[PDB]
Structures are given as C-alpha cells and as structure tokens.
Design a protein around this ligand. Structure first.
Ligand code: HEM
Length: 188
C-alpha cells in the first residue's frame, strides 16, 4: 500500500477512535512514536491488517465496520491532503476519474497493484462502478462512496449488484443513482 494512503488512514483512525487507540496499535506492530510516512514509502499490507486488527480488538468493533467508517471519514482527510482533486468538481466527475487516478498514482511503483475502479454512465442519473482488486477491501470501497456523497452534498443511492472473488480478484459492482441528473448527451 502506498505509504501516503496509510498515513491518511492513521489520521482518520485518530479522528474516529482517538489517539490512544491508534498510538497503542501502532506500537504493537513495532513503529516508533510518531512515524512519518514518506510519499515514496510502501507499507506492507500485512502490517496494515495487523494495525486494523488491533484497532478492532480495542474498539470492540468488527474490522469490516472499521473499514466502512474509515472509508466514509477518509474522504474528509483526502480533501485536506489532496485539495485539487476535489475543488471545481462534482460527485460524478470525482468518482469517474478515480480509476485513472489510482493507475497513475501507482504507475511509478514497481509491481504496483492498484484497485481498478472503472465507472461507466448508464443513464442521465446513474453510473455503474466496479471495484476489482486482489485485496478484498469491499467495505472501504463502499464507505468511500458514501463519504464522497457526504462531501459533495449530492444524494445518491447505491445498489450492490454483485460481490464475489474470481481468479483471485475480488469484485464488487455497484449502480449509483443520483437524485438529480448529472449527465447530458454530447458529441463523440
Ligand atoms: C480522493 C482521492 C483518492 C486518492 C488520492 C486515492 C489514492 C489511492 C492510492 C494511492 C491507493 C493505494 C493503491 C495501492 O497501494 O495499490 C488507494 C487505495 C484504495 N483506493 Fe483510493 N484514492 C482516492 C479515493 C478513492 C475513492 C473515491 C475510491 C472508491 C470509489 C477509492 C478506492 C480505493 C480502494 C478500495 C483502495 C484499497 C486498495 C485495494 O482495495 O486494493 N479511492 N487509493
């Protein structure tokens, strides 16, 4: 996992559960207080899982519920760390650029494995979006969508069309319907 993104998760975990829960969890995996993670660092996914496993133990919350809450809250964290990705956009632009963002924010990393997040318009008021990743972070993905709706103040409904693993890839396809239409037909 890109170290910067792990850094956003650490800040979000403090916002959600408190500095004590986080500081202790980080020290149980051997980090010294307070590690600063660099733009080029890579945190091993097994460490992330161990950090979140300790958060689950101390909060009494199941790790899926943690990831869902982290997904919702990390949009606010992203808006402070990556402000140009939010300003001057609406919810549907933001969602539809995510697949390219994740390709190119990891394109410089050797053996990179970004989630695919391909979105496609299917109606004037709806897109389909498919999470595809070997990491099976379904609740984080869904929380990020719900937090994106909150940040942009645009009402959506999310229909989870299908969720399952194939060839080692976890996939979750959602249909996102906007209360107010977001597309018009235009020239190719
Ligand atoms: C808003 C600014 C965002 C930035 C800068 C960003 C960037 C990143 C980066 C660099 C990673 C690490 C990829 C890797 O290490 O392989 C990541 C993880 C992830 N991103 Fe984002 N992302 C953003 C928003 C979103 C949104 C809106 C979604 C979903 C609609 C999303 C879905 C995910 C998921 C699910 C992961 C977990 C990794 C996995 O499942 O394989 N991200 N993000």
């Amino acid at each position: 996992m890109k170290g910067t993104i792990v850094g956003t998760w650490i800040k979000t975990l403090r916002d959600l559960y408190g500095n004590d829960v986080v500081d202790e969890s980080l020290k149980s995996v051997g980090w010294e207080p307070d590690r600063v993670i660099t733009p080029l660092e890579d945190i091993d996914d097994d460490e992330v899982r161990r950090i979140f496993a300790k958060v689950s133990e101390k909060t009494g919350k199941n790790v899926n519920e943690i990831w869902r809450e982290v997904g919702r809250q990390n949009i606010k964290t992203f808006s402070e760390w990556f402000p140009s990705y939010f300003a001057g956009r609406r919810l549907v632009n933001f969602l539809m650029m995510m697949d390219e963002v994740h390709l190119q924010l990891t394109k410089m990393i050797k053996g990179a494995t970004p989630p695919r997040l391909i979105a496609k318009p299917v109606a004037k008021d709806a897109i389909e979006m498919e999470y595809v990743s070997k990491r099976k972070m379904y609740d984080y993905f869904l929380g990020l969508i719900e937090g994106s709706s909150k940040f942009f103040k645009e009402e959506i409904s999310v229909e989870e069309v299908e969720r399952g693993e194939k060839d080692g890839f976890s996939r979750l396809k959602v249909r996102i319907k906007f209360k107010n239409p977001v597309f018009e037909y235009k020239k190719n």
